[PDB]
Amino acid sequence: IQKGKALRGAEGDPYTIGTRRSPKPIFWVPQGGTNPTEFQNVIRAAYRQVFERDVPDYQRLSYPESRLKNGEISMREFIRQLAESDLYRKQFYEPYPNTKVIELLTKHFLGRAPQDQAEIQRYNRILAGKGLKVAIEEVLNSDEYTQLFGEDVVPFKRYPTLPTGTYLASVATNDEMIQQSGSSYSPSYAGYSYP
Amino acid sequence: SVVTKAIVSADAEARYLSPGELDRIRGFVSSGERRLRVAQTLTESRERIIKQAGDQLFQKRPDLVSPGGNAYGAERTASCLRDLDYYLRLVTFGIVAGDVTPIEEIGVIGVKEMYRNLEVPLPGMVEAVKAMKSVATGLLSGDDSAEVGYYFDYLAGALA
Amino acid sequence: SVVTKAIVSADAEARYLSPGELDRIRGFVSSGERRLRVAQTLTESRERIIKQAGDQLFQKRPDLVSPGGNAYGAERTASCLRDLDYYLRLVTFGIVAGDVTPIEEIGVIGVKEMYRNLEVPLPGMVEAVKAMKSVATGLLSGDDSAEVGYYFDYLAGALA
Amino acid sequence: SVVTKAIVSADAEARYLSPGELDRIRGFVSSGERRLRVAQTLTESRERIIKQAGDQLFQKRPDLVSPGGNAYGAERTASCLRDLDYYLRLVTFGIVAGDVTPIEEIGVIGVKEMYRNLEVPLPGMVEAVKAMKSVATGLLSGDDSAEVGYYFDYLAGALA
Amino acid sequence: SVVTKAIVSADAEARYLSPGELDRIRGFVSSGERRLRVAQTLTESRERIIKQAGDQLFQKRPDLVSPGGNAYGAERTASCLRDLDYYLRLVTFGIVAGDVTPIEEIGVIGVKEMYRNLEVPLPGMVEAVKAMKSVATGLLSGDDSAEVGYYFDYLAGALA
Amino acid sequence: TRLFKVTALIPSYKKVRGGRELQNTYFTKLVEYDRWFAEQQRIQKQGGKILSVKMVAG
Amino acid sequence: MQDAITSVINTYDVQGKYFDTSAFDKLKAYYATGELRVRAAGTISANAATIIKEASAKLFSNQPDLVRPGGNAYTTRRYAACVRDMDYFLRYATYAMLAGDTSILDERVLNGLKETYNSLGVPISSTVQGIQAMKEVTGSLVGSGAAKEMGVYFDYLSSGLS
Amino acid sequence: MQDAITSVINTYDVQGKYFDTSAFDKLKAYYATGELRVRAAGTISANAATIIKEASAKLFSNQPDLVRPGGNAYTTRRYAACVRDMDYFLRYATYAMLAGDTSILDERVLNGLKETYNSLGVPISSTVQGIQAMKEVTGSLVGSGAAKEMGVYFDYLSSGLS
Amino acid sequence: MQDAITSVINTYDVQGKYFDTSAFDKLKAYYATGELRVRAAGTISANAATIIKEASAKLFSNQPDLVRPGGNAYTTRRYAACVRDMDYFLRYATYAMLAGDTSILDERVLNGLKETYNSLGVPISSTVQGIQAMKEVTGSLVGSGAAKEMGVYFDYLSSGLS
Amino acid sequence: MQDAITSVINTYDVQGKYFDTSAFDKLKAYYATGELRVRAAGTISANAATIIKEASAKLFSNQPDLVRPGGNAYTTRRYAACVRDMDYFLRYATYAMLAGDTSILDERVLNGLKETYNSLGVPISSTVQGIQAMKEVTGSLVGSGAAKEMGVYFDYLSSGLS
Numbered sequence A: 001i002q003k004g005k006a007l008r009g010a011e012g013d014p015y016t017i018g019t020r021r022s023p024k025p026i027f028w029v030p031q032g033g034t035n036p037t038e039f040q041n042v043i044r045a046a047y048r049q050v051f052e053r054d055v056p057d058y059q060r061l062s063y064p065e066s067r068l069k070n071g072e073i074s075m076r077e078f079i080r081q082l083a084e085s086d087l088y089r090k091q092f093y094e095p096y097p098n099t100k101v102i103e104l105l106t107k108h109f110l111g112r113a114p115q116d117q118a119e120i121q122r123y124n125r126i127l128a129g130k131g132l133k134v135a136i137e138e139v140l141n142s143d144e145y146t147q148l149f150g151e152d153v154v155p156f157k158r159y160p161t162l163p164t165g166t167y168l169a170s171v172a173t174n175d176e177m178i179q180q181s182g183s184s185y186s187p188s189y190a191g192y193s194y195p
Numbered sequence B, C, D, E: 001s002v003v004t005k006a007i008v009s010a011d012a013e014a015r016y017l018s019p020g021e022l023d024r025i026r027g028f029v030s031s032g033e034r035r036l037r038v039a040q041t042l043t044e045s046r047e048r049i050i051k052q053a054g055d056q057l058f059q060k061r062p063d064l065v066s067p068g069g070n071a072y073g074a075e076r077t078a079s080c081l082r083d084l085d086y087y088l089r090l091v092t093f094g095i096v097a098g099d100v101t102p103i104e105e106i107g108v109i110g111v112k113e114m115y116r117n118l119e120v121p122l123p124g125m126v127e128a129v130k131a132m133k134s135v136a137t138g139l140l141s142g143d144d145s146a147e148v149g150y151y152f153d154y155l156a157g158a159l160a
Numbered sequence F: 001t002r003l004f005k006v007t008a009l010i011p012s013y014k015k016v017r018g019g020r021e022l023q024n025t026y027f028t029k030l031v032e033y034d035r036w037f038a039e040q041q042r043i044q045k046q047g048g049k050i051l052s053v054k055m056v057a058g
Numbered sequence G, H, I, J: 001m002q003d004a005i006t007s008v009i010n011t012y013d014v015q016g017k018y019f020d021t022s023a024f025d026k027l028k029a030y031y032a033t034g035e036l037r038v039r040a041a042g043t044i045s046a047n048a049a050t051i052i053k054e055a056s057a058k059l060f061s062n063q064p065d066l067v068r069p070g071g072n073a074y075t076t077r078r079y080a081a082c083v084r085d086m087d088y089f090l091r092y093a094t095y096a097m098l099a100g101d102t103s104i105l106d107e108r109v110l111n112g113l114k115e116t117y118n119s120l121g122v123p124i125s126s127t128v129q130g131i132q133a134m135k136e137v138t139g140s141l142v143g144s145g146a147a148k149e150m151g152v153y154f155d156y157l158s159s160g161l162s
């Protein structure tokens, strides 16, 4: 009894604090049969990972979805199609500088912040030379993606332990919501009308 | 059903079912006879339920069966009532399964674009679901009606 | 816990809780008083459970308390029994929670690296938790004993 | 506009605009005076177009203006005419921009959620847009009529 | 082509062509005869273009045909002129297509590696393309000269 | 050109995976032409063996 | 996130303590309200679209300039984003009401939301007004006993945003 | 995957028929066996490690060459992959026994397994014998009633490998 | 991004107005400048490499220490990064000129660029000098009429960095 | 990263100078101790598990509150993370000792570590005491001559964290 006594009082650490956690439900598309509701769940989760929120039906890409439920493509190719769409370019490339584009790419497809200045240099050179498509395929054809998600697992948020500064950067990156106006037309203004 | 959801979730983390998941399954199977009795009560009175729900729906919305309406004519009204029969059957299936999964899989995924292709108003469907809820929960006691109302509510919300 | 698990599952899918999840929670809170009395009973007999479980373990595994064993000496035997006390307290938490989430969050995740860094044998841990299972389920009634045994099975499987 | 689409397409590929894109911009700016003539024509007849389109809408759907309708009363019928004014302004914006981006992003994205929230019937919107199309194209020259009809057709398809 | 680019762009978003894309195709097909006569006049005079362009290129950079240069000798000079003939043919293809995609797939993608494996200096190619631009724009009308010059400019920019 | 349809088997050599990982081991997929060189190189460098290559479209 | 039960469990875990009579009292208190919370959650889920309709109509009647040209809810896209946000708030308030705790409101909703709205241009006072409208609409449906419970979580959201 | 309940639901939905006496008897039978199935699943999950150890020991005692050099289970890596496959089979047999259906065995186990083993060089007959050893070891623990049910799915896996 | 037409549409939409005579005047002005803008864009694209050639040449002639040991543009990696930055500046200034608006320079270029260069150690004043050199080179090629308009956007970048 | 050689090279590169007498003296100085560095690195690599076990035991004895309920190392998860972090410190200190340079400790360990531990709630002073315990344990194994060099990098970690 003496060896199990707490020593910091009520001002101690519960298990809920400490390093942040990846979501417990892992979404994947199994090889073979899948019920309709889990398929809708996986598709919705993939859209939520790459576009940071639910995408309405009129914006969802039906051709990749048919390809995926037919088994013609894997989840990795579904994520690649979602990345290479005009909706992604509109939301996460057009309103941002390239250095911010690299950060958003790592967030959306690795569940991560950029690891080092070398990653910034590599992806910046790719973006200056080639644009979104080659940078996206570089992110998706990377060994990190195939070791974390493979072919079937929807990317999720991660808070990697190594290298240094990556955990804090990943916490800030993954906690960040979309800060930019969703459109360039018809801006809103701060102001009142008094009745 | 409940068992399929538990197994799929357990397989997601590549583990066996936890004591909580096994207690979930045990609670579901212990309640099986009750929900079977509820489903049988609903299925024996399906003609009454469908007729009364159609009466209430058409009382609430005469425009549907008035000239220029969606269900105008005997054959279109029969198609309407047959859709109500479909959803009553789906509610019985979801009652025996223990969740809205059969309802969603057979009658909710793609329902909006389907009824759009058919020029069927969605609020009419919601009100028909409410009417069928009322008639069906009339046949059941408070405890049974309470759980059946949840499935009817899921259906109405998914159409809305 | 049961409510936390249902809510997290619904939040991952960005939906409200289904009738099935609500029914699971209702059946959970309906059975709160009996599982709470079980936790009461285990808390009352904590000292007896630790005493008898330690005695059973050291009779079945004399190498642990012999020289060269990890628990040799009064101090290391007391640390052994204190780990048993930790796990019994986690089991009471898991009983009131309705799942093994407290047990997994405090005493399972990372246990292998911990006990490797302590030179503590894992078969010794499974023998100790099975001893505690026997002692604790001896006190309770049959259904409550089976419920508690499920949590001790989860723990033994996590260690093994 | 057309220029913006060409630029974003070039930028996503980290390149200068190709001769085809520059030819497209050249053709767009060489048609600018005609587009401004058409947009100014649609601006002059704003009130004529809106009042005629409202008349055509309200004769075809009296129940909308009748008691219990969505637009019943001076305030709600004024809100209806105000929405028609919104969309005619959007059509002029699309005419000058040479494409339907202003229309899609001011009045198409989320329009179904808007009008579900407001309980406005979408077929009413569609055939009100067809009424504006007929009235507006009755005023323009045949060449201009086809061009304006393209934007009205796009908007009508977008509402459905 | 312009048509292929428009269709591919619409297909990527899974939609029909917008009024802007249809306007682009209209403007392209309305200028088809002009592009056709431009390609005709380039084709019927290709020998003059290639001869004068080779003369100008070797005058501006004699080091290529000086001993030790990449184009030294009648055989290598003939290969040089054959490459210029290739690029004139691709420019005619690009003129009729309305875009620079035939040039891109046939003679730009991989041109860097090809000419490095040939030891051909890219600045020499760029100056040869300028020589072809001058010679070809010499024998066409001002607007036709501008139209061919845009494609020649793209080819020079791609070669550098 | 256009799409290949490739069937490959990628065994595991650096560890033993607790997940089912069968869909990550033997799989058939469609690769674009412009991607197939890199994809084939990745399959080879992971120690995987390519069962078959076909030309579906083109 | 943590519910009420795991809140108690954590309180006793940091102290290395088995459950006291007071711990059992708090657990009984949460178990007693469970059927009430489940009924209220089911009612809210069944009426989410209606609740959003009423609350947004009230907000746009009380602040018309929000939906006039130049306003933050002026476009179809921005109006849809507004009602989407209201659905977020209602659903997460329902999660918190089932949990019996506001931790999920902290981690999932209120974290960085003030700076997000400031960067977006969303008026935060108008959003608190929308949440208050939603509270009023929900309280009538769920009943007084459940209304008092849901008001706590609506107030937590409003205070965190304010 | 597919449950027994989902099985009846599909067989009646493709007919467009409500449940009849036969369907209600089938559902009653599954509901009656549910408690036994849950007991067996709990016992198996509690003893999964012990079953895998006993079964692997029995398999490698009957076929010692499999773990000597030149055997397909000669390396720590291939031995680990072997016991991992056995754990796969036990866990999925438990899933399917709980479901009262062999759908999950087809969809997530046997789909492309025979060809994968053929390409890897895995002896299918020896894997089948390991599955059989799991059958006997599991049947020893779960009891007479659950042994036949669990061996149904073990035999399904054995035949799907055969 | 906004171009000139988008800017006019915005200024008239945020106040609920149809286009006026002033709006049509701005639109006519942009359509009139369109041909000159397209010609300049084509010329710059044809000569982007040469513009970077001469701009970097004269920037490193005025500031030799940049490319000499100890300078920020001294290594092949850092020199290549510098010319890549000049490529960015030319391409985006050409985009902004073709659009008739500076919004793309705000969103895609200048947003956070001083932060980036401060963290990198890049001398911002010398970058402004490189942009001025690029202006000088480009104005020669595009001709005076296009030189004025293109120098507008070069000066926008120079003022945003300085 | 940098080592002694790479440090000297970068020093002479930023001046654009060829190697001088003092440079070759420093290079000889590193080459002379390379053998001792390899020997010590192999010693830590062999005994890393023992070092971490003994250092963690010493630290948790000196500060028992770290692993009592409510401590920052109280859970199997947080205890594992603590001993894992100590293993990281030992491994990176061995890298630094082998490289003859503390640059890797800055760039790959110490940069952003205080901020990380502050956001986590990990007590930095206790982490420093753990590093000191690692120093004490490692010094006995490596031997005094290697122990001084190893203690250079251990104290570098402690000072950077302090």
Ligand SMILES: CCC1=C(C)/C(=C/C2=NC(=C\c3[nH]c(/C=C4\NC(=O)[C@H](C)[C@H]4CC)c(C)c3CCC(=O)O)/C(CCC(=O)O)=C2C)NC1=O
Residues within 6 Å of the ligand: A017, A018, A019, A020, A159, A160, A161, A162, A163, A164, A165, A167, J066, J072, J073, J077, J078, J079, J081, J082, J083, J085, J086, J088, J089, J092, J108, J109, J110, J113, J116, J120, J122, J123, J126, J127, J130
């Ligand atoms: C190579 C450089 C490097 C270091 C050192 C590093 C440390 C580090 N420790 C972490 C968590 C942690 N670190 C500790 C460390 C212990 N807390 C106890 O009080 C002790 C005083 C102390 C060690 C002696 C603990 C308890 C956690 C929380 C673990 C959890 O919540 O599960 C985390 C958050 C991410 C994760 O746990 O996976 C990092 C990044 N990361 C790095 O990239």
Ligand SMILES: CCC1=C(C)/C(=C/C2=NC(=C\c3[nH]c(/C=C4\NC(=O)[C@H](C)[C@H]4CC)c(C)c3CCC(=O)O)/C(CCC(=O)O)=C2C)NC1=O
Residues within 6 Å of the ligand: A062, A063, A064, A065, A066, A067, A069, A070
């Ligand atoms: C753009 C190129 C493209 C095509 C052409 C295409 C067709 C297509 N239809 C499919 C399914 C289907 N297709 C149909 C349509 C049939 N039902 C019958 O009654 C009708 C006679 C007939 C249609 C006129 C149906 C019912 C399914 C679902 C089958 C199932 O879910 O098992 C599938 C399998 C996956 C899915 O559900 O989407 C494909 C790939 N997909 C594409 O990406």
Ligand SMILES: CCC1=C(C)/C(=C/C2=NC(=C\c3[nH]c(/C=C4\NC(=O)[C@H](C)[C@H]4CC)c(C)c3CCC(=O)O)/C(CCC(=O)O)=C2C)NC1=O
Residues within 6 Å of the ligand: D064, D070, D071, D072, D076, D077, D079, D080, D081, D083, D084, D086, D087, D106, D107, D118, D120, D121, D124, D125, D128, G060, G067, G073, G074, G075, G076, G079
């Ligand atoms: C620029 C993009 C944009 C649009 C289009 C838009 C429409 C819009 N229409 C509204 C109301 C309304 N809208 C209508 C129009 C409908 N009534 C009939 O059914 C017709 C079929 C149909 C019009 C043709 C009516 C009647 C109302 C009043 C609803 C009420 O007060 O209960 C409202 C709520 C605030 C208000 O009363 O002004 C909006 C925001 N808002 C926007 O920011």
Ligand SMILES: CCC1=C(C)/C(=C/C2=NC(=C\c3[nH]c(/C=C4\NC(=O)[C@H](C)[C@H]4CC)c(C)c3CCC(=O)O)/C(CCC(=O)O)=C2C)NC1=O
Residues within 6 Å of the ligand: A053, A177, A178, A179, A180, A181, A182, A183, G066, G072, G073, G077, G078, G079, G081, G082, G083, G085, G086, G088, G092, G108, G109, G113, G116, G120, G122, G123, G124, G126, G127, G130
């Ligand atoms: C559950 C956690 C969560 C929250 C809370 C959340 C809010 C949120 N609302 C957003 C947009 C928005 N939100 C609003 C709502 C405002 N408009 C009116 O003025 C009202 C006062 C008010 C609502 C009652 C609007 C208009 C936008 C559009 C902003 C824009 O596109 O310019 C955005 C920007 C990106 C997006 O479109 O989703 C976020 C992140 N997102 C989350 O993941």
Ligand SMILES: CCC1=C(C)/C(=C/C2=NC(=C\c3[nH]c(/C=C4\NC(=O)[C@H](C)[C@H]4CC)c(C)c3CCC(=O)O)/C(CCC(=O)O)=C2C)NC1=O
Residues within 6 Å of the ligand: H060, H067, H073, H074, H075, H076, H079
């Ligand atoms: C070359 C790669 C390789 C290794 C290393 C390997 C080890 C190995 N040792 C085994 C048996 C064994 N191995 C041991 C060894 C232990 N006895 C004491 O505890 C010591 C701590 C320790 C030895 C120093 C024992 C006791 C058994 C018999 C266990 C039994 O069959 O019940 C077995 C089971 C099959 C058999 O009996 O041969 C394997 C697979 N197998 C391989 O393919």
Ligand SMILES: CCC1=C(C)/C(=C/C2=NC(=C\c3[nH]c(/C=C4\NC(=O)[C@H](C)[C@H]4CC)c(C)c3CCC(=O)O)/C(CCC(=O)O)=C2C)NC1=O
Residues within 6 Å of the ligand: F011, F012, F016, F017, F019, F020, F021, F022, F023, F025, H066, H071, H072, H073, H077, H078, H079, H081, H082, H083, H085, H086, H088, H089, H108, H109, H113, H116, H120, H122, H123, H126, H127, H130, H131
């Ligand atoms: C969840 C369903 C599932 C199954 C069943 C499955 C089987 C499977 N077994 C594999 C390897 C293996 N499997 C075995 C086991 C066999 N060889 C021994 O001789 C025994 C006779 C027998 C087991 C009783 C061995 C030895 C390997 C290693 C093959 C190698 O890499 O050389 C692999 C390749 C990936 C890896 O090495 O981890 C798969 C995919 N995978 C799945 O996802």
Ligand SMILES: CCC1=C(C)/C(=C/C2=NC(=C\c3[nH]c(/C=C4\NC(=O)[C@H](C)[C@H]4CC)c(C)c3CCC(=O)O)/C(CCC(=O)O)=C2C)NC1=O
Residues within 6 Å of the ligand: I060, I067, I073, I074, I075, I076, I079
């Ligand atoms: C430490 C790594 C590094 C290198 C290597 C480097 C090379 C370098 N050489 C340059 C100029 C030059 N370099 C050369 C050398 C060429 N002349 C012939 O063509 C030969 C084929 C070839 C040499 C064998 C010439 C002629 C120039 C003058 C270019 C001019 O003034 O236009 C310049 C431009 C600035 C200047 O004039 O100093 C650089 C940056 N810079 C670096 O930071």
Ligand SMILES: CCC1=C(C)/C(=C/C2=NC(=C\c3[nH]c(/C=C4\NC(=O)[C@H](C)[C@H]4CC)c(C)c3CCC(=O)O)/C(CCC(=O)O)=C2C)NC1=O
Residues within 6 Å of the ligand: A097, A098, A099, A100, A120, A121, A124, A125, I066, I072, I073, I077, I078, I079, I081, I082, I083, I085, I086, I088, I089, I108, I109, I110, I113, I116, I120, I121, I122, I123, I126, I127, I130
């Ligand atoms: C599209 C808008 C955009 C810009 C402009 C941009 C600039 C940018 N410049 C960078 C580096 C650099 N930039 C320069 C350029 C400077 N060095 C000399 O002093 C010159 C005065 C001056 C150029 C005229 C240099 C030398 C580096 C390398 C810095 C380093 O590695 O330490 C980097 C880091 C990645 C890399 O090394 O390639 C970025 C992101 N990023 C963007 O997203």
Ligand SMILES: CCC1=C(C)/C(=C/C2=NC(=C\c3[nH]c(/C=C4\NC(=O)[C@H](C)[C@H]4CC)c(C)c3CCC(=O)O)/C(CCC(=O)O)=C2C)NC1=O
Residues within 6 Å of the ligand: C064, C070, C071, C072, C075, C076, C077, C079, C080, C081, C083, C084, C086, C087, C106, C107, C118, C120, C121, C123, C124, C125, C128, J060, J067, J068, J073, J074, J075, J076, J079
């Ligand atoms: C609730 C989560 C949790 C657990 C379980 C936990 C266990 C734990 N047991 C420890 C020591 C110990 N643990 C044991 C237990 C072993 N003795 C025999 O071998 C048995 C097989 C076995 C127990 C049944 C012993 C003997 C020690 C003393 C180690 C020593 O003195 O070197 C320590 C080292 C610090 C200390 O003694 O206070 C921890 C952290 N810590 C946690 O935060």
